[PDB]
From a paper:
A truncated form of yNAGK spanning from residue 58 to 356, corresponding to the AAK domain and lacking the C-terminal DUF619 domain, was produced as a soluble protein in milligram amounts in E. coli. Four crystal structures of truncated yNAGK, ligand-free or complexed with either NAG or NAG and arginine, were determined using for the initial phasing single anomalous diffraction (SAD) from a Se-Met derivative. Four subunits, organized as a dimer of dimers with D2 local symmetry, were found in the asymmetric unit of these crystals. In the structure of the truncated yNAGK without NAG (resolution 2.95 Å), the lid is observed in two different open conformations, which are, however, less open than in the structure of the NAG-free EcNAGK. Despite the different oligomerization of yNAGK in relation to other NAGKs, the AAK domain structure closely conforms to the canonic α3β8α4 sandwich NAGK subunit fold, with the N-lobe spanning residues 96–272 and the C-lobe residues 273–350. However, in yNAGK the N-terminal extension comprises two helices forming an angle of approximately 45°, and a 5-residue N-terminal extended coil. These three elements form a platform or “stand” which mediates and determines the interactions between the dimers across the Q axis of the tetramer (labeled “interdimeric junction”). At each interdimeric junction, a four-helix bundle is formed by both interacting “stands”, burying an approximate area of 910 Å2 per subunit. In any case, the interactions mediated by these stands result in the association of two yNAGK dimers into a relatively flat rectangular tetramer with approximate dimensions of 35 Å×109 Å×83 Å. This tetramer is perforated by a central hole of 18 Å diameter, which is formed between the two domain bodies and the two interdimeric junctions.
Numbering used by the authors:
A (entry chain B), D (entry chain D): 63 to 351
B (entry chain A), C (entry chain C): 62 to 352
């Protein structure tokens, strides 16, 4: 069955200081149920920039009996390989145009990156299960406008539950499929949001490198956002562009559905353990007012 | 590859051993230090719904003695039943299914369920299994207007399968393919399995069916041996060589034209899998290039 | 020493942790690399028959976090009951049992049963335990004609206890002794445990009883602290210091005259054992040399 | 739970060739009833002369799931340490006179040797349980004639069954105790016989260095003895003296009680595996006619 080395337990004791922190951990350690601990979204950047530390944190979670649902993008590497072979990434309305060749590259990267993370975990003794399809079902977002780029309509939970029941961290790509079986590129930030919607986990964490969201107006990191008060305002501010725009969109929608206790934490990997085990996060914390 | 003989492993190993010949045959495989892949194993989907426990037990045994097979399975009768439940009739032409987009939705859904059933079946026996549903087979369309979403395989990416085996987990593949662009295409599992054989050059190639081999429809008897250099051309021009047997016996001949003379594809019932691999049984239909 | 925190270990470790002080106390013992023996633990036989599950769980925890204690237990009330069943009355004189040959047969048989119960209780929680029924305590007769087969311990052979701990199994000792010539002699478990302390110089010395410490019979309150350099002589000349408490408090004073000032003997209820060892509880009666 | 390495299984396959050899192993591997596999008596000599190989064989049995009951003497080492300190071993009627000091040495040796075998096993990954008392109960053989030397009246099986149930080989000394708790020295060869009597195991094996019993008349090893025909005769032969005398006595008595299928095999360690797995022993095989 389950057992934990002295390092693992030392690291557990290093994360847990108060009584409610203790009870929180015990709640999810001993939980037998299909309401999970965490959805963690991993920026693709992180896998090629900081794999060891990403793999170590997740490894630690697994070693203390916590099975977060991991879903990663493949952002920069796709743009890299396109540019590498004399192709310039095409964009419009803040979303990538994906033809027969571009999806070929997106698929290739997703597989490469997903296997990199899975293997880094396995090497650290963590049972990791790649889940590259059969989770997201989508119809086209705007067939003519964006080509092979979808919009998630439902989430089949079964593969993920099967994975956790077997003692393996599910490691998901954000690729979707039409029912008919055309793979459609979907934004990792909204794909994680849809996982969060159905699994209603305790913790929703998005990992990026900047460790939050920066207010361009001041150049200071935004520590808290109270959507009820600030959503409409924040969307009008000129410094909010591109990927911070639709990220905040999904997170409002997501938190409109989820109860008042839930929140989304946008953080750096180095704060992950501290975010999961305690009620004091760093980075940008986004909750409903 | 982790060797770890559990109680049930030890009992299964010894159960039908009776002569020093059989003992010496097992020692051959256990004392070996070959970096060669042990087996490609094609599973009729029927076997997943009808004999999941037997299938899983036999694969468990191979896992536990550190002789990991690559497993490729089809979707069984379910697909047609599920379509029959909604009322859609299966159209085959020349032995291949007219897989339209509505039909594909059901094929996908069946593959995913069958695949996870077998994978969980193994996990429940403490056998690490890794479901590989995509990124292995890449295919062009076979004939868009004729068969619709059915593929002809062109390349095989070995990486996920290897990753799985190195990680200590049996790779369990569905036999779907995708175009480079990401459209899933249904592919004949007998062909799919053959392609894996072509690329992994394994010690044993095994096809599992419920009939327990290939039946000679004219004499009503199971065919034990097939020398393909001599028997192939006359065996093909027959009335009892079915829609699905044409493609199965064809791919096997093409595969053994590419593989060396030492190789051979056995077609057997699940219950005869252990004795087919380790003893040199006359069970099922054995097929080889021949003199 | 093997650290291996099972689920129940992790739950027991965290269950009463509430401040960073308690967390830091557990890190003290886990990050340590001391070659010092962790504990000698004396078990009233009553606890084996009455609270075996609690005893076993608490020892299981120490085992699983690799802080193995030496455990020395008595034979509880059973002996007297078993004698009372056959009709023989227990004779004590000055606080020690007149153990004749018939009585010894019962004492032996009880010790062996109690010892195996506790050992098996541990094994059933997946804790290796080794029953050590002889070859540890060697004794002269205390007073043949007075107490008959009762011993005064003279030497202790450490070897079996060390062998056990090195093999990864808790040593579970009965408190019998033998003459060099091999005659078994009944010995006071409080004294026996003290002798192990004397020879192993452990971090913690703990005596388990059901009462939960020593009760001050005049005020009806439990005594939390005893500074023996100051309090001993006046604490002895009292009406509520019983037959059995004289010898218990006496041996503890003699032992701490031999041990250094850092040492201390705690007397507590089984349920407070974990918090007594790792946190610095005020539960039970604590006894030390003092200023 | 239970698992076996590739070496262990290779060695199992090397011992098992025929179908009934296979069925025999499986019968005792899968436990079935309160039926023990083997009582093995180990000459004390073997523990100080050939420990590694003794430990390896027993280790192998344990690794294939067989739990023999091991009971060892302490023959030569006791005589050694007496002589080592200027004391000559006293003897009479073929049995050792054991006073306050001699028993002191016997006890010391039994503990030393019993821990040596137990540790040799533990070092090879075998769970071994020392069982030094509480098994044999004996009254004096002839108090005045031999002093502290007993005669076994009963065997308490519980410690041994407890050991096997816990997955640990019981490793017994041949020391007995009066009910009143005087330890009485008992002959390992007859002590094993009393274990054999109550446990009615499939295999009774006595290990010695010569690997059997030698007929002094010819100087040839005796391969078979049919007690019904030869007991009375063999006991009259002048070459049968000392420890072969009362060894053959117990084995006749033992086999009078046990059924016709049972036998005692007196062999060398190097033949142990072959003795236990097959119906063809070396050394001296003693059965009822």
């Amino acid at each position: 069955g389950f057992s934990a080395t002295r390092s693992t337990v030392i690291q557990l004791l290093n994360n847990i200081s108060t009584k409610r922190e203790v009870e929180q951990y015990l709640k999810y350690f001993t939980s037998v149920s299909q309401q999970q601990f965490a959805v963690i979204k991993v920026g693709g950047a992180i896998i090629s920039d900081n794999l060891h530390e990403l793999a170590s944190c997740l490894a630690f979670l697994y070693h203390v009996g916590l099975y977060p649902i991991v879903l990663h993008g493949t952002g920069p590497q796709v743009n890299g390989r396109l540019e590498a072979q004399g192709i310039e990434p095409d964009y419009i309305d803040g979303i990538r145009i994906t033809d027969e060749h571009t999806m070929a590259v997106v698929r290739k990267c997703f597989l490469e990156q997903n296997l990199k993370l899975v293997t880094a975990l396995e090497q650290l003794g963590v049972r990791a299960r790649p889940i590259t399809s059969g989770v997201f079902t989508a119809d086209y977002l705007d067939k003519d406008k964006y080509k092979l780029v979808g919009n998630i309509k439902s989430v089949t939970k079964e593969p993920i539950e099967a994975s956790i029941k077997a003692g393996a961290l599910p490691i998901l790509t954000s690729l979707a499929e039409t029912a008919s079986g055309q793979m459609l590129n979907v934004n990792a930030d909204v794909a994680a949001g849809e996982l969060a919607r159905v699994f209603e986990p305790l913790k929703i964490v998005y990992l990026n490198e900047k460790g939050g969201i920066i207010n361009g107006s001041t150049g200071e990191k935004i520590s808290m956002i109270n959507l009820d008060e600030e959503y409409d305002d924040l969307m009008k501010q000129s410094w909010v562009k591109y990927g911070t725009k639709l990220k905040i969109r999904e997170i409002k929608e997501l938190l409109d559905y989820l109860p008042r206790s839930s929140s989304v934490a946008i953080i750096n990997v180095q704060d992950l353990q501290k975010e999961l085990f305690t009620d004091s996060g760093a980075g940008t914390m986004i909750r409903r007012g």
